[PDB]
C-alpha cells in the first residue's frame, strides 16, 4: 500500500496523546509525512474548532490525505471537521468502527478522546486505520454519494 | 426538567435497536413525543444519509429538540447530520462522552452503532442523555460559537 500524508491536531486536552501518537506513527511505513497543526502545549487554550477546521482544510486543499484529531472526548473535533465541504469525520474507539470509517464511510478524519480511551488502544487503532483503503467502486460509495449530493446545496461566499 | 421532543431514525442495520430504544423511551417523562422518520423494516434499503438528514432537518425546522439515530456503526448517520446547518451530531458509546455531547458540544443528535454496542448499554445511555441540558452561558458556548461562525460562510441555494 502506498503511504499517506497525515495531518494531526489536538486541543489542550489532547496534547499528551497527540505527542504519543505522533511518535508512534513517525516510524510507520504507511505514513509519508505528518503535518502538525497544533496545539503544541497544554498552555495553548485555542478552542478545538479552529484546529479541527485547519487540519480538515489541509485535506480539502490537497495538502494531506487524512487527519488524526485528539481532544477531551474526540467529539468536538469530529463535529467541526464535518462542517468542511467534502470532509467526513468520525470519533471511533473500537477496531470494527475504525475499519468501517474507511471502508464504508470513506472518512478522511479519525478522532479520539484522550479523557475516555487509553493510549495503547488509541495507538493500535491508528495503526490499523492506515491499513484500510476505501474502494470507490464499492456499494458503500453510492451511500457516501448521497452525503455529497446534499453538500451540493451550499455555496461558500466567505 | 421539561420534556423534550425527539426524532428517531435508523437504516436497515439499526431496526431492532431502534424499536427497543423507542419502546424504552416511550414511558420516559423527559420525552414529550417521538417522531419516527424510519426506516420501519429491515427490507427498506434506503441509504442512511436520507434518514439522518430528514431527522436533522426536523431539529433545524423547530419540529423536534433532539434526534436519536441508529445504524450499523453509528458513524454514517453522525457524519450526515453534521452536514445540516446548525446541527451538531455525535457517535457515543460511553457515559462520559454522552454527558459531554450535551454539556460541552450542545449536540442535538446522538448516534449508536447496533453492530458495535449492546442494547442495554444503549438504552442506559439514551436515558442519561435526556437528563443533561446545555448551559448557553457556559464557557463551552464560546467554543460551540466558533463552529457556528464557520457555518456563516455558506448559503443554501438549492
Ligand atoms: Cl476494539
Ligand atoms: Cl460507559
From Swiss-Prot, chains A, B:
InterPro entries: Rib-5-P_Isoase_Actino (IPR011860), RpiB_LacA_LacB (IPR003500), RpiB_LacA_LacB_sf (IPR036569), SPI_LacAB/RpiB (IPR051812). The keyword Transport does not apply. Keywords: Isomerase. D-ribulose 5-phosphate binds at residues 11-12, 72-76, 105, 115, 143. It comes from the Eukaryota. Coiled coil: none annotated. It is an enzyme of class 5 (isomerase). The active site is at residue 71. Its EC number is 5.3.1.-. GO terms for molecular function: isomerase activity. Homodimer or homotetramer. Belongs to the LacAB/RpiB family. This is Putative ribose 5-phosphate isomerase. The lineage of its organism: Eukaryota, Fungi, Dikarya, Ascomycota, Pezizomycotina.
Amino acid at each position: 500500500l502506498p503511504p499517506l500524508r497525515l495531518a494531526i491536531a489536538c486541543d489542550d486536552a489532547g496534547v499528551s496523546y497527540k505527542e504519543a501518537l505522533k511518535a508512534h506513527l513517525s516510524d510507520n511505513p504507511l505514513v509519508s509525512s505528518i503535518t502538525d497543526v497544533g496545539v503544541t502545549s497544554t498552555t495553548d487554550k485555542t478552542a478545538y474548532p479552529h484546529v479541527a477546521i485547519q487540519a480538515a482544510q489541509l485535506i480539502k486543499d490537497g495538502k494531506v490525505d487524512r487527519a488524526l484529531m485528539i481532544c477531551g472526548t474526540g467529539l468536538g473535533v469530529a463535529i467541526s471537521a464535518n462542517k468542511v465541504p467534502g470532509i467526513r469525520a468520525v470519533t471511533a474507539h473500537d477496531t470494527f468502527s475504525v475499519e468501517r470509517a474507511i471502508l464504508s464511510n470513506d472518512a478522511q478524519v479519525l478522532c479520539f478522546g484522550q479523557r475516555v480511551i487509553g493510549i495503547e488502544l488509541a495507538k493500535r487503532l491508528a495503526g490499523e486505520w492506515l491499513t484500510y483503503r476505501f474502494d470507490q467502486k464499492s456499494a458503500s460509495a453510492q451511500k457516501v454519494q448521497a452525503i455529497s449530493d446534499y453538500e451540493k446545496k451550499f455555496v461558500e461566499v466567505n
